[PDB]
Design a protein around this ligand. Structure first.
Ligand SMILES: CCS(=O)(=O)Nc1ccc(Oc2ccc(F)cc2F)c(-c2cn(C)c(=O)c3[nH]ccc23)c1
Length: 109
């Protein structure tokens, strides 16, 4: 049986696949509430999360384990579902990314 590190797999396989997805671009940096005109965002969302922050955490030895990283991805998706209206384009984009994420995480070593 091959021994492959879970956090390494999360960086090189999982994050890489999601980052390249056509719907990844609104999730590659923190939400810019000022430019997007969402003045209530940082009041409703208490733990903001994005793939750019996850990428930095994976590169800067932040995570204790793979589950702490998985929680950051889940926070990013649920923040989107909490803030935005169902049926909004951004929600449809997050749902497609979350479906791909769950597929990739099923094959985690
Ligand atoms: C890179 C971060 S950014 O903030 O610098 N750029 C950025 C650009 C577009 C965005 O969304 C859109 C998507 C598809 C459209 F057709 C129009 C949009 F505006 C969002 C965006 C992200 N997220 C997570 C939300 O929850 C959200 N709610 C409302 C906007 C958003 C963020």
């Amino acid at each position: 049986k091959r021994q492959t590190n879970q956090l390494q797999y999360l960086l090189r396989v999982v994050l890489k696949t999601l980052w390249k997805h056509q719907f990844a671009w609104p999730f590659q940096q923190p939400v810019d509430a000022v430019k997007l005109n969402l003045p209530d965002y940082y009041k409703i969302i208490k733990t903001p999360m994005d793939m750019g922050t996850i990428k930095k955490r994976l590169e800067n030895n932040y995570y204790w384990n793979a589950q702490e990283c998985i929680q950051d991805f889940n926070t990013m998706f649920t923040n989107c579902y909490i803030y935005n209206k169902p049926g909004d384009d951004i929600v449809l984009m997050a749902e497609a990314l979350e479906k791909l994420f769950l597929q990739k995480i099923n094959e985690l070593p």
